Write a protein that binds this ligand. Sequence first.
Ligand code: DGT
Ligand code: CA
Ligand code: CA
Ligand code: CA
Ligand code: CA
Ligand code: CL
Ligand code: ZN
Length: 575
Amino acid sequence: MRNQELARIFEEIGLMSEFLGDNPFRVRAYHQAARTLYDLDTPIEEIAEKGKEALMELPGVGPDLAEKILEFLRTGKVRKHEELSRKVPRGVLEVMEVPGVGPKTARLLYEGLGIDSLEKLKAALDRGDLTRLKGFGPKRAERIREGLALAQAAGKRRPLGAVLSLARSLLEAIRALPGVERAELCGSARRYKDTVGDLDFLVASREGERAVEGFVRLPQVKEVYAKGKERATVFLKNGLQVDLRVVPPESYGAGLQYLTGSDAHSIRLRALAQEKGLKLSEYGVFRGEKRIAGETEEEVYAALGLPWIPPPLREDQGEVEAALEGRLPKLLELPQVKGDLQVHSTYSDGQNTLEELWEAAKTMGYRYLAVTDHSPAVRVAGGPSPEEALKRVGEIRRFNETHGPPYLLAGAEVDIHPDGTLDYPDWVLRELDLVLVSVHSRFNLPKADQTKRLLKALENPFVHVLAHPTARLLGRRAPIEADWEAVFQKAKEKGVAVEIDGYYDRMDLPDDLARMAYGMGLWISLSTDAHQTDHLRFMELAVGTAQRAWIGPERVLNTLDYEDLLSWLKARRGV
Ligand SMILES: Nc1nc2c(ncn2[C@H]2C[C@H](O)[C@@H](COP(=O)(O)OP(=O)(O)OP(=O)(O)O)O2)c(=O)[nH]1
Ligand SMILES: [Ca+2]
Ligand SMILES: [Ca+2]
Ligand SMILES: [Ca+2]
Ligand SMILES: [Ca+2]
Ligand SMILES: [Cl-]
Ligand SMILES: [Zn+2]
């Protein structure tokens, strides 16, 4: 559907027209045309095929607008939009939009200040300039800076784990709206993508316009960017940018598929539908005018002749073909994970004592937790020395002797020196239950040298896991350059697992490299890199990554019970 695209063009013409000071009657007309297109559920093209008169049946559309609709559908553009685009630069428009701004304001801003982009705005805000620009006073000094921040974030992505819990708190409030029967967080978040744009929620309601109204008036909502009969876009007080879509209860499952995507997955499904004489839309699966499915997502998949496909797979990367052949991959699920294989303590950089870690693991129903404190080079600090590290192993053994399950594995996160040697001697490594190795320095070695360093680390027969292998930090540090094929192949041959560290700004291995490692036949270790007990919740992110990577419970260390894990760790491994 081109409905939203056309709504935007008309809206922009409205803004640009008012900026230029066109007839306020026309300005309002374009905005009313935009609302109509925003709210219109049936494809505009279907009404345009019926003629100019039929277009004119739509609220707000007269002869002038009906012709612009046809022009857009036939050419892909609207000359009037292109014309005002010649008079109106990009950032000047951007200034007028920045939530809380607008055209006439932006015109004094343009004429008065010389603003046809954004940096200038910022400049004026911080200096107090707008406090002296005619028509730019008090409570609005706040609003404009705030709007600017919202605009600048809308291009950008955040780590899934930075926003998932906040999204779920909004989900609780949405579910609690009177009139909402079901709701779910959809979009890329439901697919466990490691960074997300806006957050998208689907609601089932028999009274959609009233559900939108309750939604936009939630205590959590700061600013409404767009709203209509069945949809809205808002900004929360906490900054989250949120889209809502409402469908009737009979359509909920079709709405879940629609809003979860990916777009590429949905394109595949719509074609499968039409190939068997059906139409898949946000509102259901239809044979002619008859709705044959829609209420649950599994029903929708079934009507297309498919098993239900887990959201993390919905990327058009082989899952449609696997579903068609009745051979979806077996995927790791969160209840199968029996413990977390990288947690830190007060012995190094963690906030928690052994007792606190144990208590948290016990609450979570884990069988074990690996306490993997840093070797001395990781933290750029004197200890824990090799002697101290072994003293700690004894302390953890005594803790297990006095506590029982969940058992603590006495581990270490051992720094890899620039030359590939390890930051504890073998007499320490041999006594640890779990040896992780990782890069914490010299991140920018040439690719071939970084590869040699990692290969040398993998020569050590006491290593169990290559921890957070790329060392990336989302928003702060790029992945290290290394030949991952060479590294993973050596790890496989030596019996070393690779880690999926679900700590929210690490997400390392990333899904794509995890898919490569598992496809090459490696073992996988999941962890949260916890430095406080609140971090243990990130195991869901590591499992979501595993699902995106087509990883099953086979060859995942965390699915082994305690005894089988210890056996694996002690065993002759590799080729
Ligand atoms: N990408 C895309 N998705 C669409 C379109 N029409 C409907 N959808 C569905 C599939 C998307 O997964 C879902 C949410 O759209 P978004 O643009 O928010 O994308 P998504 O949440 O998948 O990714 P994001 O992390 O926001 O970039 O809406 C379209 O034109 N493009
Ligand atoms: Ca009309
Ligand atoms: Ca409710
Ligand atoms: Ca989204
Ligand atoms: Ca969206
Ligand atoms: Cl469902
Ligand atoms: Zn580390």
